[PDB]
Structures are given as C-alpha cells and as structure tokens.
Amino acid sequence: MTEYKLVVVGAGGVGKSALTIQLIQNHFVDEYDPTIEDSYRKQVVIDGETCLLDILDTAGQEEYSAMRDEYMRTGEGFLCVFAINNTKSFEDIHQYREQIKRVKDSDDVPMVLVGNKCDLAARTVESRQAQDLARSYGIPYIETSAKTRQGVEDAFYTLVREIRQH
Ligand SMILES: Nc1nc2c(ncn2[C@@H]2O[C@H](COP(=O)(O)OP(=O)(O)NP(=O)(O)O)[C@@H](O)[C@H]2O)c(=O)[nH]1
Ligand SMILES: [Ca+2]
Ligand SMILES: [Mg+2]
Ligand SMILES: [Mg+2]
Ligand SMILES: [Mg+2]
Numbered sequence: 001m002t003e004y005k006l007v008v009v010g011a012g013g014v015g016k017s018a019l020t021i022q023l024i025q026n027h028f029v030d031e032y033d034p035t036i037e038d039s040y041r042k043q044v045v046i047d048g049e050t051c052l053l054d055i056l057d058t059a060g061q062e063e064y065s066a067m068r069d070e071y072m073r074t075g076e077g078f079l080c081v082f083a084i085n086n087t088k089s090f091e092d093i094h095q096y097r098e099q100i101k102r103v104k105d106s107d108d109v110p111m112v113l114v115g116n117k118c119d120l121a122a123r124t125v126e127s128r129q130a131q132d133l134a135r136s137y138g139i140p141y142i143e144t145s146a147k148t149r150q151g152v153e154d155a156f157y158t159l160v161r162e163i164r165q166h
Contacts (some may be wrong), residue, residue, distance in 0.1 A: 001043070002051040004160050007072055009096045010081035011089035012060035013055060015116040018146030019081065020057045023156050028147045034061045037071050046160050053156070065113040073103040077110035079162040082130075084143065092128070097137065110162040111139045115153050119145035131150045 008016045017038070018029045024040045028100035038057040043050065056075065059065040080096050080117055093113065100109055106153035113134040115125065127143065144151035 001091055003054055004051060004163055005054050005056075005074060005076040005110060006079065006156065006159055007075035007077070008079045009058050009100070010060055010079075010114075011083075012062075012093045013062060014081050014083040014086060014089045015144075015146045016060060016079075016081050017032070017057050019114070019116060019152060019155070020055055022146045022152050024055070033102065034064050035059050036064050036066075036152060046157050051160070052166060053160075055066070055156075067102050068112060069099065072100070073093070075100075076166075077112075077159045079112055079114050079159055081114040081116050082125065083117040084108070084125045084130075085117055085120045087124045090115075090125045090133075093133065099125070101118075110166045111140055112143045112155055112159045112162060112164070113135065115136070115141065115143040115149075117145060118143040118150060119148050145152045 010016055017035050021029050024042050036059055038056045042053050058068055078100050080093055082093050115130050130141045142151050142155045144155050
C-alpha cells in the first residue's frame with residue numbers, strides 16, 4: 001500500500017506530540033514531556049485509499065534537537081506547528097521552513113501550517129496573520145486543538161493531500 005512519511009516540526013511546547021498522539025492514539029496528553037525523536041505508524045483510509053502513515057515527532061527544544069536534520073531529510077511532507085497563544089513560536093516558523101528547504105534541497109516541499117491550541121482563549125496570533133504567512137508559502141493554514149481534537153485529522157489528512165499534489 002501507499003506509505004506517507006510525515007514529519008511534525010515546530011517550537012518546544014507547541015503541541016507536536018499531543019497532536020500526533022491524538023491522531024494515532026485518540027487521547028490528549030496533558031503533561032509536558034519534551035521529545036527527542038519518536039516515530040508512530042498507523043494504517044488509515046484517506047479518500048478511499050488504504051495507506052500507511054509514518055509520522056516522525058521531532059524535538060522543539062534546542063537541547064533535545066540533536067541530529068534532527070538527519071531524521072528529517074527522509075520526510076515527504078511537514079506539519080509546521082506553532083501555538084496560537086505563543087507569538088514567539090509563530091515567529092520561529094520561518095526558520096523551520098528554511099531548515100526543511102535545506103534538508104530536502106527544494107523550494108517546493110509539501111507542507112501545512114498549523115496553529116495549535118485553538119481551544120485556548122489567550123490568543124496572540126490571529127487567524128488572518130497565519131493565513132497570510134501560509135499564503136506566502138503557497139500552503140494551507142489549519143487551526144487545531146490536540147485537547148478537543150478540533151482540526152487534528154484535517155491537518156494530517158490535508159498534509160497527505162498536499163503530498164499527493166506533489
Ligand atoms: N490546551 C491545550 N494544551 C495543549 C494542546 N496541545 C498541547 N498542549 C499542551 O502543551 C504542552 C506541550 O505539549 P507537547 O505536545 O508536549 O509539545 P511538543 O511540541 O511536543 N514539545 P517538545 O518540542 O518539547 O517535544 C502539554 O502540557 C500539552 O498538554 C492543545 O491543543 N491545547
Ligand atoms: Ca490525558
Ligand atoms: Mg514533543
Ligand atoms: Mg541539503
Ligand atoms: Mg497582534
């Protein structure tokens with residue numbers, strides 16, 4: 001069957017692990033354990049196609065971000081995640097995109113910009129700002145909550161549909 005290699009990147013604490021765990025395991029991780037590099041695999045049907053998702057959950061913490069570029073160059077599509085209540089994580093996005101362009105050696109890499117923690121009221125990044133950033137990259141913007149599950153499937157499946165247009 002078709003395998004899609006997805007990689008989730010973004011600043012420490014924005015909810016990369018929680019998103020992935022909600023998608024694959026259907027529960028919300030409330031605690032914060034910083035990731036080094038973890039892998040998840042799951043067979044799913046997306047738009048009628050049975051396929052295998054291989055998801056790399058990467059470190060956001062600079063202290064844990066060793067050899068991240070190595071694990072990443074194998075990725076086919078990337079979720080670039082920031083948190084809507086963390087302005088710095090949004091500002092950090094451009095540098096994750098640059099890293100991806102480097103590891104893939106291409107300006108045309110399947111990506112989705114994800115604004116996570118949309119269940120939270122302390123918003124400092126407005127939807128329109130994120131829409132504009134995504135538009136400049138030529139990619140979708142989707143808001144998610146790993147807590148409520150809002151947009152979680154949408155984000156990952158959209159990433160798959162982006163790889164498919166590639
Ligand atoms: N309210 C809320 N909290 C969230 C959401 N996603 C993650 N969190 C919380 O934010 C914290 C960090 O989440 P985590 O998934 O560990 O972040 P990470 O990006 O994987 N961190 P790291 O880069 O260090 O591995 C946890 O306490 C988690 O419960 C969300 O959508 N809503
Ligand atoms: Ca929990
Ligand atoms: Mg993590
Ligand atoms: Mg390179
Ligand atoms: Mg503002």
